[PDB]
Design a protein around this ligand. Structure first.
Ligand SMILES: OC[C@H]1O[C@@H]2O[C@H]3[C@H](O)[C@@H](O)[C@@H](O[C@H]4[C@H](O)[C@@H](O)[C@@H](O[C@H]5[C@H](O)[C@@H](O)[C@@H](O[C@H]6[C@H](O)[C@@H](O)[C@@H](O[C@H]7[C@H](O)[C@@H](O)[C@@H](O[C@H]8[C@H](O)[C@@H](O)[C@@H](O[C@H]1[C@H](O)[C@H]2O)O[C@@H]8CO)O[C@@H]7CO)O[C@@H]6CO)O[C@@H]5CO)O[C@@H]4CO)O[C@@H]3CO
Ligand code: HEM
Ligand SMILES: C=C1/C(=C\C=C2/CCC[C@]3(C)[C@@H]([C@H](C)/C=C/[C@H](C)C(C)C)CC[C@@H]23)C[C@@H](O)C[C@@H]1O
Length: 465
């Protein structure tokens, strides 16, 4: 019948287990799969949940049974925030198809599908690097500038413009939205979802999340208004105009799923999905380059060979730069920015590997455990870019690397993110040498959150040529 799993206390189930563990949840779950198998279950305060561990079981569900596992779970928090509409936490259905299709098309059309786009990224690297230079090699935290820079790339697509690094109102909105992605992972919210009557309690991380969500919702709708002011119907300049075009064409269809609400939800989802994740990839990579300068320098050696010490980075250089691509893939594999993906749910009663999974069960894809699957990786616990190089020195793509997930819900911003990653990384490492202050001992244990990010750390960036 249902998959087995560790026991915990009545009422709260394995919320106790996760909470009581020294380990972060994805690590905890991986360890439990060594006892209970690749597919096991957790009881999260009475919400029944199955966890998928290792590459084979994750592929078997999200790919072989893609429609069955394409859904999102109706956790109280998700219902409150977005009523299971929008895009990211939309239920699998027509609503999702509509918003997904529009986003995919918008990102090609207003983004990388256009000849001029790559240089808009490069402009952002100049703004970014220039900002870094202003510190004149003195130690500082990159978090804010990186966030500014990365978020601007999607701002171009969604709003048709970048915002300046003085726009603290926008920055403040992103700051609250990040807290929410972090708080989504807390015991407090796992309990809230189990016992939603906890909403009566005025104190705690759940009230912080709802308060934040309110402030974020208002701001985003105000931006969306400002973005639609000069709109020329059926000639859109960005995703917002495109969305409004859609609402116009579905005016007489009552079952049309586009709405002012769903526009705010899907815009917010697109903004935070891009900013949280890519920012953190770069923050992890910078951390590791400062920690392992022989790797940093080998990357820089390739930049100098292929880009020259002075030439403008190009996406087209990627395939002349396998060691650089290797480092970046190894950051993704090792640091696991989205360790447990986004939770799925079964759109119907499912049977997988003999076990039954009733419709609506939360299904956690432990992407961490895929990246550490010893069937497919040698010494996964070791940071070693070289694992991605083949015997001729070229980058070798591995099927068991899935940091953007698989199946119907796979990251929709994958291609854009890879361009940003590559171009920001090379632009930065071409212009600066990075190292820690007083060579201070930095912390590599990630913070608990729906994404993994490093603790605050200072860096010195010193010009090179
Ligand atoms: O005031 C009497 C109060 O009695 C009952 O509440 C008890 C509660 O059930 C217990 O859990 C415990 O509370 C402790 C709590 O568990 C700790 O977490 C803590 O608080 C920290 C929080 O963790 C942290 O989040 C933050 O708190 C901030 C809030 O998150 C934030 O939302 C805001 O709070 C303000 C609210 O916006 C607003 O509701 C208003 O509060 C009034 C309530 O509306 C009203 O119901 C009543 O509260 C009763 C309650 O009904 C019982 O269940 O009066 C409140 C006015 O005093 O104003 C809030 C205050 O600004 O801002 C806070 C900023 O702190 O930080 C704290 C740091 O400690 O400590 C608690 C220790 O008591 O006990 C309480 C009763 O003591
Ligand atoms: C390093 C960069 C990124 C990483 C590691 C990452 C990671 C992920 C992961 C793990 C998922 C889970 C999919 C699932 O199993 O349901 C996902 C989906 C998603 N991502 Fe990303 N992401 C990145 C960049 C982006 C960017 C740049 C955007 C938007 C600009 C974005 C927007 C989304 C959205 C909207 C979904 C949900 C898609 C759906 O529900 O169909 N992500 N991403
Ligand atoms: C969609 C929106 C809202 C909330 C969005 C949230 C709040 C809870 C946590 C969510 C659902 C995140 C979940 C946990 C997914 C996070 C993945 C890992 C991302 C960061 C890659 C994404 C949007 C977050 C309501 C409101 O604030 C407007 C905003 O547009």
């Amino acid at each position: 019948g249902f998959p087995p799993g560790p026991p915990g206390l009545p009422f709260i189930g394995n919320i106790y287990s996760l909470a009581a563990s020294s380990e972060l949840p994805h690590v905890y779950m991986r360890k439990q799969s060594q006892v209970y198998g690749e597919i096991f279950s957790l009881d999260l305060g009475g919400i029944s949940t199955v966890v998928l561990n290792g590459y084979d079981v994750v592929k078997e569900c999200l790919v072989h049974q893609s429609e069955i596992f394409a859904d999102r779970p109706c956790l109280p928090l998700f219902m409150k925030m977005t009523k299971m509409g929008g895009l990211l936490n939309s239920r699998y259905g027509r609503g999702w198809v509509d918003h997904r299709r529009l986003a995919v098309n918008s990102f090609r059309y207003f983004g990388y599908g256009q000849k001029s786009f790559e240089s808009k990224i490069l402009e952002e690297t100049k703004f970014f690097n220039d900002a870094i230079e202003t510190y004149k090699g003195r130690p500082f935290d990159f978090k804010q500038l990186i966030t500014n820079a990365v978020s601007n790339i999607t701002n171009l697509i969604i709003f048709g413009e970048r915002f300046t690094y003085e726009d603290t109102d926008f920055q403040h909105m992103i700051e609250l939205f990040s807290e929410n992605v972090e708080l989504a992972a807390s015991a407090s919210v796992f309990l809230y979802n189990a016992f939603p009557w906890i909403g009566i309690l005025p104190f705690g991380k759940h009230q912080q999340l709802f308060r934040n969500a309110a402030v974020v919702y208002d701001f985003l709708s105000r931006l969306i208004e400002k973005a639609s002011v000069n709109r020329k119907p059926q000639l859109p300049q960005h995703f917002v105009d495109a969305y409004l075009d859609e609402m116009d064409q579905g005016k007489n269809d009552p079952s049309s799923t586009f709405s002012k609400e769903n526009l705010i939800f899907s815009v917010g989802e697109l903004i935070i999905a891009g900013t949280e994740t890519t920012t953190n990839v770069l923050r992890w990579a910078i951390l590791f380059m400062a920690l392992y300068p022989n790797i940093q320098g080998q990357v820089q050696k390739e930049i100098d060979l292929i880009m020259g010490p002075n030439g403008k980075p190009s996406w087209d250089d990627k395939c002349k730069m396998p060691y650089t691509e290797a480092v970046l893939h190894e950051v993704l594999r090792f640091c696991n920015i989205v360790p447990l993906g986004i939770f799925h749910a079964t759109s119907e009663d499912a049977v997988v590997r003999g076990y039954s999974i009733p419709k609506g069960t939360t299904v956690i894809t432990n992407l961490y455990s895929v990246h550490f699957d010893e069937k497919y990786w040698r010494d996964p616990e070791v940071f070693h870019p070289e694992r991605f190089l083949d015997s001729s020195g070229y980058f070798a793509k591995k099927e068991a690397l899935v940091p953007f997930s698989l199946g119907r819900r796979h990251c929709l911003g994958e291609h854009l993110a890879r361009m940003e990653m590559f171009l920001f990384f090379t632009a930065l490492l071409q212009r600066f040498h990075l190292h820690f202050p007083h060579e201070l001992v930095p912390d590599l244990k990630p913070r608990l959150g729906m994404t993994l990010q490093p603790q605050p750390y200072l860096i010195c960036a010193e010009r090179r040529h």
